[PDB]
Structures are given as C-alpha cells and as structure tokens.
Design a protein around this ligand. Structure first.
Ligand SMILES: *[C@@H]1O[C@H](CO[C@@H]2O[C@@H](C)[C@@H](O)[C@@H](O)[C@@H]2O)[C@@H](O[C@@H]2O[C@H](CO)[C@@H](O)[C@H](O)[C@H]2NC(C)=O)[C@H](O)[C@H]1NC(C)=O
Ligand SMILES: *[C@@H]1O[C@H](CO[C@@H]2O[C@@H](C)[C@@H](O)[C@@H](O)[C@@H]2O)[C@@H](O[C@@H]2O[C@H](CO)[C@@H](O)[C@H](O)[C@H]2NC(C)=O)[C@H](O)[C@H]1NC(C)=O
Ligand SMILES: *[C@@H]1O[C@H](CO[C@@H]2O[C@@H](C)[C@@H](O)[C@@H](O)[C@@H]2O)[C@@H](O[C@@H]2O[C@H](CO)[C@@H](O)[C@H](O)[C@H]2NC(C)=O)[C@H](O)[C@H]1NC(C)=O
Ligand code: NAG
Ligand code: UCJ
Lengths: 528, 532
C-alpha cells in the first residue's frame, strides 16, 4: 500500500489513486461521499451530512452523475458530447473530488473549488474538461470539485413548503464547502485560503455564495467565468417557480404541497427529466426550468439588490467572458441557425430570433432591442444579422450581467480583475461563424492542452500554462499578475485584458454601449 | 419719360419697378407689390382677402414693412443675430411680395423660384439682406418671387372652430401669394407652369405643408426644403394646445374682462400689436429651445391630418424634391436656453447641465423618453467629457427638430414615387461671427444659395464666390429640370441606399445615411415609446 493515497476524513478512511501528468504524478481522491444519498423521501430536501463509515471508502474513480437531461441535438458530435454525462445517472450523486500534489503537501496549500455550469439542469464534476490533474501539478494547489443536484432534483420549489423548499442544489454546494473547511487540511489544503471558481451556472453559483452570508464564511476569493448571479436566467421568482413545479406535477400525472411532492417522489427520476423543458412559459434559448429561487432565505433579496447594497471591501474577484458568448445558444432555437450552415439569417428570422432570445418581454421592449442591434445602413445584411443576434443573446445573458456585477462590486470596495477570452482552439469542432463560443476557455484554464493524447499546438500549451498561472496567482494573492500588467477593473475606466496567444492587451469597456441599454435603460422601460 | 422695362400690368393694375445694379449686370425688381388687403383692425386673425384693383400706377420700388413680430435681444448689436431682425418698420400692414426678373425682361417663359423665409413662424421678412434675389436672377436667369406672411399670433393664433380666429392664416397668406404668381408671373416673363418653392426652417416646413394641402399643390411643381420639414415636433400644434395658448395669451392681456370665441377675439383686436408680442413667449407650456408659441394647427382644413400621416399616405409620383441640412443644426439653438451655453465661451457643459439640457431640448416628454434620449446620446466610455457632452446636446436638438424629420420625409417621399435629392451643407463661412464651437450653424447655407458672396461690399474669399456660384447652379438646375446635375454626379436619395452629397469647397462627395442610427431612434422607436 501507498501511504500517500491513504487519508482519514472526519467520516472515515479513504483510498485514493496516483495519476500521471506530463509534469509528474498527482494524488487524486475521487468519489468521496459528502452527503447522505438524497433518495426516496429525501428527494427535493436539503442535503444531510454523510454519516461516518467503517472500513475504507474506494476513492479511485468518479461517482455517478446527478440525474439530468442529455443533449441530443447533434448525436455523436464532440462539441455537444463533451458536456454530456460520462458516468451513469443516479440520484445517489452527492460526491466530491480532491486532487493534490504527489507526495501530498506537508504545508498548507491554497485550495481551488470548482463549481461546474450547465444551466442548473446539467453538468458533472467527472467531465474530461474539468480534470484537475494539470492545474494541481503545474501550480501546486489543492483542487476540489463537487457534484450538486440539478434540474427538478436540485431546484424544484414550492416556496414556503417544507417538502420542496427549493435551492437544495445550492445547499449541496454549501455542504461541500463546509466539508472542505472541515477536511481539506487532511490532504494538505489550507482551509483559510479557499478560492471558488465556476463557469456559467457555476459562476452564477459562485456569485450566490458571495451574496448569502452562511456561505461567505466558507471561502475567501471568487472567480466568475461567463456568468453572474444577476442575469435574467439564473433566478426565478416565487410565483413562477410554484407555477413551474405545479405544471411538472400535472405533466407526470400528479395532483396542497404535501400531497403534490409525495406524488412526485413516487416518479422515476427519468420521468421528471423527460418533461423538464415543457414547463418553460415560451420557446426560448438561454432559459432553464428549475433554477435558484429568490424566497428570502438563501437569497434575502434579488442578486441585483444585494449587489447594490453590499459592502465588498476586502474581496477580490476575477471575472470575464469569451469573445462570442451568444453563438452557441442560437442553434438551440433561433430560426435559421445550425452548426452545419453559415446561418446567414434574414431580417424576418432576425426579428423572430429576438423574441426567442429575449423571451417574456413586451413588444415595446423587443422593439427597443431591434433598434439598438440594427445597423440602419445595412438592416438586412445576413452576416450582420447573424452577428447581431449572437450579440443580443450574449449581451443580455452573460456580458452585461457580468459587467454590472464587476462595476458594482468595484465601486463598492472590491478589487476586480476582468478579461475577455479571445482564442479559438485549434481543436474546436464548432463552425467558424461561432467564433470563440461559450465554455471554450475552460479547457485552457484546466491545462487540458498539456495532455499529449490531444492535438493542441505548442503555442496553445504555453497559453494554457499562462492562464493556469494567472488563475493560481489570483488564488494565492488576489492578484493574477506575475510579479505587461493586468490592471483592476473600475466602474469609470472599465479596464480589462484580452486573453489570447498575444501578450496581454488592456482595453476599456465590456460592451459599454450595449450594456448601458440592458443594465440602465431597459429595467426602467419594464417598470412603465 | 419712363423705362418700359420697369412698367408691368398685373391683374390688379399697373406697377412701376426699379433697375437694380448687380456685379454681373442689370436686374429688374418690383419690390412691395400688394397682394392682399391690409389685415388690420377687424381683419386681424382673419384669412387674407385679395388686393382690390387700383387705378394709376403703384410704385413697387422698395421693400414694404415687416409683419409685426418679436425682435431678438439676446446679443444686441451682434451681427449673428441682427442679420435676422427686421430691417423695415413693423406693421400689421405687411402683405406684400417681391419679383426680380432679368433686364431686359425674358421673351420666353422663364422658370420661377418662390422663396418662403423661416423664423419659427414668429419672425422673418422677405426684405432681409440675406434673401436679396438680385444675384440668383442675374447669375441663373430665373424669375424670383418672395412674399411676406403674417407670423406670431397675427398669423397663427388659433381658436379652432371659430371663424374669427381660425388659425393658419399666415399659411393662407403664402397660398394667396402663390395664387398671385400663377395669375401674374407671366407678365414679368415667368412661367407659371414651372414654379419651384424653396424655403428654410419654418419656410421649409411651410413648403412641405403646401405639398400636403391639395389646394396649394396645384400652384407649384417642385419643392426645396432647407433645414426643415412639416413633420417636425415644432412645426405644428394640436387643436387643444393651440386653443390653450390662444386663451392664455388673451388672459395675459386682459381678454375677457376664455368663454365666447367672438367676444374673445373682439377683445384681442383692441389690443395694440406690441402688447400681444410682449406676452407671446409666456404661453409655452415649459422652458425650451426650438419651440414657438403660434405655429400651424392641425385642424382638418389646411392640414386634413398630421403631416406625418399625410406623408405616409401620399402618392408623390411626378414630384421632384431637393432637401438637406447644415452640418450642425442644433448648435445655434443651445444659447437660447440650454444651461451652460453661450456664444461667448466654449460652453463646455457638465454632465448635470447636459441632463438638464435634454429636458429643455426635448420638452414635454415623459421621464422614460428623456432616459431613452440620454441612453442614446451618452458615450458610456466618456460619460462626463464636457466637449463630447456639448456636441451631444447639439446633436440631440438638431436631430430631434431638423435632421430626422427631414430624413423621414425624404425617405417616405422617395419610397412613394418622388425623385429626391439630399445634401449636407458643411462649409463654415469665412465671415461667420458665431463662435467656432458652433460649427456650421442652422441658417448659414442661405447666403450661399442667394449668392450673397458676389456682393462687392462684403469680404468673402474668391473660393466662396465660386462655391456660391456652384450652389446657385444646382438650385436653378433643379428648378428648370427637377435635377440639380448639369446636363461628379449627385445621385437621388432613396430609402435603401440613402445617398446624399456634401456641399463644401471640395467637389461633391457621395455619402450614405442622414444620421441613420440616430434617426431610427427618433423616427421609429420613440413614437412607439410615447404610446404607452
Ligand atoms: C441552415 O440550416 C437551418 C436548419 O436546418 C436544419 O439543418 C440542415 C441539416 C438542413 O438540411 C435543414 O433541413 C434542417 O432543418 C435552416 O433552417 C431550416 O429550414 C428548414 C427548411 O426551410 C425549416 O424546415 C427549418 O424549420 C429551419 N430551421 C431553423 C432552425 O430555422 C436554414 O435554412 C439553413 N441555412 C441555409 C440553407 O442557408
Ligand atoms: C358668442 O358671442 C357672439 C358675440 O356677438 C354678440 O352679439 C350680441 C348678442 C351682443 O351680445 C354683442 O355684444 C356680442 O358681440 C354671439 O354672436 C352674436 O349673436 C347674436 C345674437 O345671437 C347675433 O346677432 C350674431 O350671431 C352675433 N352678433 C354680433 C356678432 O354682433 C354668439 O351667438 C355667442 N354664442 C353663444 C353660445 O353665446
Ligand atoms: C458660459 O456662459 C454661460 C452663460 O452665461 C454667461 O453669463 C455671463 C455672466 C457671462 O459670464 C457670459 O460669459 C455668459 O453670457 C455661463 O452660465 C452662466 O453662469 C452664471 C453664473 O454662474 C449664471 O448666472 C447663469 O445663469 C449661467 N447661464 C446659463 C445659461 O447657464 C457659463 O458658466 C459659462 N461657462 C464657463 C464660464 O465656463
Ligand atoms: C471688408 O474690408 C474692409 C476693410 O479692409 C471693410 O469694409 C470691412 O472690414 C470688411 N467688410 C465690410 C462688410 O465692410
Ligand atoms: C427660428 C429659426 C432660427 O428656425 P427655423 C425653425 O425657422
């Protein structure tokens, strides 16, 4: 036996596995139970701590993926299958993973905690693109990632009810963060230096832990990649959450809240998944059925309101976006779009796409979108319309929520660093018209290009090593700079850097003109 | 001993004119021809009546009186403002017109240009030096006509429905002059079947209203709209708001001691003309720039609908129009009420003064609408740069009142059968007395259209004289042919390509879009916003 792979947690003993990287070995502890399995009567309920076990838990392989919808838009296509579950689905899915250097560190080592995205309806810590071995070897951190419940299992809410209070998937995350505080030192990690990082709904999750006091004591720094808690998709009101939960029950043959949840608990998990998309109020892209609910407990107010009221002195945040946030989502419902065409849409398709990408707004609000995003010297140019609808979806859902979060946090005491990721991977299987699509900086942050079995260029590996150094520099010090400098983002100067194969370039404004529309004017329009 | 060239018989009787010297040769001028009975006493606020025939010879030898009007006092003695102020005595006896013709008189019928001055429907006169028609007639051998029309309350006070102050009588003054041209211009050598209206600011709005009023449209064949359009937010008023303004004016001068309309106007008619002028600005609903108290009223008679609706519903096949704007339409107006502005300094305003100026420049709109304006005209990478803010507020006022109304009319006329030519005038005269930050201000293309640089007593450069001769040729070519191009080309403006040309000392340059991004806000979105 190898003593470096034997660890005792508070719940008992674990057996890890030695992993190889091109830079040397890494210790991995995969599939550590941190909660009791949320099954049967535990479905929809907050997680409970895993009870202690005798013997040695096998922690040499990833555990099951939480039950979720499986994308079937392009079967067998690398660009979609890389996000699909790579382990069997199960409601017994509340496990987390710890990578550490080999041999295990003997001094407290900074901890990175990864929260995956997936629109709160999908995702897994076991995805190849989230493999922590390269970050841990290159930058000598401890990396933790957890599975959390998604879809109805994590976020179905009948607000005020106790059988389905909502946001339990966020409580799964919080329980994992409490687990890190209590046990990460046994792996060499420093519980006093925990940096949360996450992408899309993972970034939204990070922001929500920033705005929920019970979570704030469990970490010290935050990274939000291509997502924010204050967008139009990451939260839902109590009334609409109840309507969606009630329609799902009807769609699966179920009838007060007590009897409703009891009937839902009798249904196979896959039956809930098969009706998940049909509780949305309209055809759309970038909207998900079961998301965090604002009900006064986990979030005592809207994320917007909590961001505006917060004192954020002493917090450092790293936030950013990819160059083309909107393009990926257009093939999931915007008319005229496909990954196998040029998607050169007409004005009619553009106008129809605006209602799909900006759903549930008045005709006047939609007219305002069309005004801002039309070039009135080229109102019908297909290439310009394609780019414009990509901008609509990306600005509305990602760029402008991130810009507002960054500006408000900076103006209220936080040190913010902002980036735009502008390198299209040579490996990218999506068509050229999508540019740098949503999600495709993750493989570089995790050092995946260092994997020899993959086909990245020599320059891309150096680029990955640069990004891993920025991220780990930020985790260690709150400052990504290697001591061309990366300046903090401020509400006035609005400075950010471009991340690509070229050295850092400092620019001003995260789509400032467009985001003034989404963040300043449009909310006034919807009030009246 | 008389000169046969200076004697003309019109339908009302005989006239005697004068021979005008010009740098290029002699011109015949008949200045101060009565075309209506004097609208005095009981005739105040009433539609004009045709001038009754006279015996003997009327001396049409000098400009007649300016119609009674407010006199600008913002910068006393400043050439930039005094050039627009009355240069004849003020009088309600002011319905006279002017005819310039070549010397000797043309033998074959000659195209006619008819000028309608601007001045916000509250001021102006055909006698202003800058409207001297002698150079156009000499250079391009056309007949030039200009008329005085009543302004202010005398021309546009309206108690809608009443026959004692029906409104729009200043427009009826213009139409009667136009009827006079149809009936009499051939006696001067002019061709009544080739008449081109042209005007600037309120004169341009007037031209457009004659295009949209069937009884006027039969009296001309082509139109030129300089820096103005009938569909602007300042050029017309609704029936109720016109009544409110008339009733408030009467109240401020002691009438009645609202109520009965006949009683009210009878009391108004006893008030001295200057007393009404002294309270004219007090009836506006708020502090503003580019808003005028008494303007054409949309009451179903002269205008059967709003100019917007008439433009959208009209068939304009067989019409040629020439339209355009100056480069900085808004700047002149900011010193008349926008906080922080003055011709004397650089008017580098603050953000707070910019936001306050938006409400002055876009008066009587909801807070939401004002927010939309601020959104579109703020550079959110430089939201507080004083120079950018000054320029932005100029664009706000200029796009809202001139550029975008002109662009809407140009686009709809073109799409509905008219041949349209569009320009942007971008030469700042060497003699301009306004400060440099104002750029090319509203109204300062006129002197080049009328060829004023050819006047020996003024100091224009030689290139500006050549420029002035170029523009006169464009305008006269359009008057003769419907196309400013001489028999680099000036392409027609269409709703798609939206091409226009730049007028300056360099040869014509073709460009696209009359501030298309901005005017989409004003012409397409903002009306939708004001509807809920
Ligand atoms: C680009 O493709 C889209 C989507 O079409 C799908 O993908 C291709 C395999 C193609 O062969 C289509 O049959 C597929 O439906 C096209 O938009 C579709 O057009 C069809 C036929 O008119 C219509 O039934 C679908 O509803 C449309 N789908 C969407 C999402 O709009 C689009 O026309 C193609 N672009 C081209 C050819 O330029
Ligand atoms: C509104 O007022 C006019 C005012 O005319 C009055 O005529 C006399 C009756 C006298 O009161 C004068 O001082 C006024 O000037 C009315 O029009 C008059 O009506 C009278 C009688 O009906 C008739 O001879 C004429 O129509 C008008 N006389 C004039 C002009 O001398 C009008 O009827 C009033 N309307 C209402 C509803 O009261
Ligand atoms: C630019 O001038 C404006 C306009 O008014 C000036 O006031 C005179 C006293 C004189 O200074 C001239 O240059 C101008 O005619 C200034 O704004 C004025 O400021 C004064 C004093 O605070 C105030 O009483 C007026 O109400 C202001 N007028 C307006 C229209 O707001 C402005 O301050 C000047 N800009 C500078 C000095 O940078
Ligand atoms: C033209 O020049 C002379 C001075 O040389 C003088 O008349 C004046 O300054 C200028 N302009 C006018 C209108 O007189
Ligand atoms: C008042 C003058 C300057 O403008 P126009 C609208 O006539």
């Amino acid at each position: 036996e190898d003593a470096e792979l034997l660890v005792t947690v508070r719940g008992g003993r674990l057996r890890g596995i030695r992993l190889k990287t091109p830079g040397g070995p890494v210790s991995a502890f995969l599939g550590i139970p941190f909660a009791e399995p949320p099954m049967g009567p535990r479905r929809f309920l907050p997680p409970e701590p895993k009870q202690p076990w005798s013997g040695v838990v096998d922690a040499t392989t990833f555990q099951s993926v939480c039950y979720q919808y499986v994308d079937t838009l392009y079967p067998g296509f690398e660009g979609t299958e890389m996000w699909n579950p790579n382990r069997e689905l199960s409601e017994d899915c509340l496990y987390l993973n710890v990578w550490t250097p080999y041999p295990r560190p003997t001094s407290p080592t900074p901890v990175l905690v990864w929260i995956y995205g997936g629109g709160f309806y999908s995702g897994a810590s076991s995805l190849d693109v989230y493999d922590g071995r390269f970050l841990v070897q290159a930058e000598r951190t401890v990396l933790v990632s957890m599975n959390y419940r998604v879809g109805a299992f994590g976020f179905l809410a009948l607000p005020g009810s106790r059988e389905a209070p909502g946001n339990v998937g966020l409580l799964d995350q919080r329980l994992a963060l409490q687990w890190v505080q209590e046990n990460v030192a046994a792996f060499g990690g420093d519980p006093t230096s925990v940096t949360l990082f996450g992408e899309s709904a993972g970034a939204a999750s990070v922001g929500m832990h920033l705005l929920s006091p019970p979570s704030r004591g469990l970490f010290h720094r935050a990274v939000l990649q291509s997502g924010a808690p204050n967008g139009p998709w990451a939260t839902v009101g109590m009334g609409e959450a109840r309507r969606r939960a009630t329609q799902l029950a009807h769609l699966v043959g179920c009838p007060n809240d007590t009897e409703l949840v009891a009937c839902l608990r009798t249904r196979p998990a896959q039956v809930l998944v098969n009706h998940e998309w049909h509780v949305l109020p309209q055809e759309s892209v970038f909207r998900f059925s079961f998301v965090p609910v604002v009900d006064g407990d986990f979030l005592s107010d809207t994320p917007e309101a909590l961001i505006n009221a917060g004192d954020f002195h002493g917090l450092q945040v790293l936030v950013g976006v990819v160059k083309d946030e909107g393009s990926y989502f257009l093939v999931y419902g915007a008319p005229g779009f496909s990954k196998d065409n040029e998607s050169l849409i007409s004005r009619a398709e553009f106008l129809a796409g605006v209602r799909v990408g900006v759903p549930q707004v008045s005709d006047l609000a939609a007219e305002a979108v069309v005004l801002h995003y039309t070039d009135w010297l080229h109102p019908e140019d297909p290439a310009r319309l394609r780019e414009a609808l990509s901008d609509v979806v990306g600005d509305h859902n990602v760029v402008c929520p991130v810009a507002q979060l960054a500006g408000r946090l900076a103006a209220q005491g936080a040190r913010v660093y902002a980036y735009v990721f502008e390198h299209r991977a040579s490996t990218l299987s999506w068509p050229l018209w999508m540019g740098v699509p949503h999600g495709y900086e993750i493989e570089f942050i995790f050092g995946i290009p260092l994997d020899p079995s993959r086909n990245y260029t020599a320059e891309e590996k150096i680029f990955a090593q640069r990004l891993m150094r920025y991220w780990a520099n930020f985790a260690r010090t709150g400052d990504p700079n290697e001591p061309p400098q990366w300046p903090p983002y401020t509400a006035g100067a609005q400075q950010y850097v471009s991340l690509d194969l070229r050295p850092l370039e400092v620019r001003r404004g995260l789509r400032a003109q467009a985001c003034a529309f989404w963040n300043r004017f449009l909310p006034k329009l919807l009030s009246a």
